[PDB]
């Protein structure tokens, strides 16, 4: 199937409570495999999936050097952005970065990503060309000019097309039994009367991986988007995910409703009904 790798950096200032915290986590698809936290008693890159544990000491030290250096640079960046927005020394602020590479079903690079935010709003993004930037405002334009002057895009491109893809393919092979395994949802429909003339039908999907899934209700074959309650896909804690979709229907019309489920683990979409 298709696969991606992403790293997620969060740098958070906290005036009066020490230097800004830097935490990095790494993912292949929906599986976290590393972490680094500057607030740890002894900050170091730590494994978070069994298949990364085989990497040697040089790997762990290489990661740790990268994250320790980033910790320091992000503190400078937080100071710089405070200034670009004319902000006080009093408030706590956050820079986030997410970046990585997407591969298609053949293992070839589909595209790269490298996006940053400040206080939860887009700040600067590497364009799909991996060569130019989109800045969200005149503050981010300062960063853009600085990064253009230092030919930063060229560095990001070299990584995204090179080491990013190479290491993702390695992880996919080393973790093939899980990373390249799609677990289909286990499904059922429940029925709960809400009154004498209405009942809730809830369509459940449990135990699936990866998290991407489509769960919908149809009435007489028509999508019921507005009248469907859909919860956010949620982690079970055993690698798998859960989701449900509910609709409130007239008592006696239950058989006019069908739940449709699509998931990578499914050869063909499922259609389910309440089974009294």
């Amino acid at each position: 199937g298709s696969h991606s790798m992403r790293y997620f950096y969060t740098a958070m200032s906290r005036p009066g409570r020490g230097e800004p915290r830097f935490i990095a986590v790494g993912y292949v698809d929906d599986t976290q495999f590393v972490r680094f936290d500057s607030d740890a008693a002894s900050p170091r890159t730590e494994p978070r999936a069994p298949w990364i544990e085989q990497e040697g000491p040089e790997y762990w030290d290489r990661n740790t050097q990268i994250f320790k250096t980033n910790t320091q640079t992000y503190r400078e960046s937080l100071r710089n952005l405070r200034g670009y927005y004319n902000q006080s020394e009093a408030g706590s602020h956050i820079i986030q970065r997410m970046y990585g590479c997407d591969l298609g079903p053949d293992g070839r690079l589909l595209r790269g990503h490298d996006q940053s935010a400040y206080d939860g709003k887009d700040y600067i993004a590497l364009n799909e060309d991996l060569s130019s930037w989109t800045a969200a405002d005149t503050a981010a334009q300062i960063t853009q000019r600085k990064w253009e002057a230092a030919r930063v895009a060229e560095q990001r491109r070299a990584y995204l097309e090179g080491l990013c893809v190479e290491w993702l393919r390695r992880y996919l092979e080393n973790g093939k039994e899980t990373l390249q395994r799609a677990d289909p949802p286990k499904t059922h429909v429940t029925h709960h009367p809400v009154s004498d003339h209405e009942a809730t039908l809830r369509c459940w999907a449990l135990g699936f991986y990866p998290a991407e899934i489509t769960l919908t209700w149809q009435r007489d074959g028509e999508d019921q988007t507005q009248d469907t309650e859909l919860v956010e896909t949620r982690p079970a804690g055993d690698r798998t995910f859960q989701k449900w979709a509910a609709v409130v229907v007239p008592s006696g019309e239950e058989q006019r409703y069908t739940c449709h489920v699509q998931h990578e683990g499914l050869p063909k979409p499922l259609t389910l009904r309440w089974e009294p």
Binding site: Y7, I66, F67, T69, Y74, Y99, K146, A150, R156
Partner: peptide, 13 residues
Amino acid sequence: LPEPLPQGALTAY
């Protein structure tokens, strides 16, 4: 593997 450090100094925002 995360983005490696550049040959020159890592550029801040």
